[PDB]
Amino acid sequence: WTIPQLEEVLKRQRAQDRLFAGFLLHNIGTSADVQLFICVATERN
């Protein structure tokens, strides 16, 4: 994909609604991963 044919694709991507999660983060001393989990109701796991 060169320059002039992906802007429409980006517009299409933005056109459809999306979900997101926000983060605020700082230095922790050692590089490490972050694992997220999605608890749901039923107890709760």
Added chain:
Amino acid sequence: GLNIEQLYNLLEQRRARERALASFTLHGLGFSANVRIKVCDHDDDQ
């Protein structure tokens, strides 16, 4: 309404029952308190 023989028969028939018990070893913390206990499925591992 139960007499000596009545409570007797009750005790022998009760001795044969099969029960789930919680065994407690308590001592008191200087104040009256209560403990509520709950059971859950054996799931130790959504």
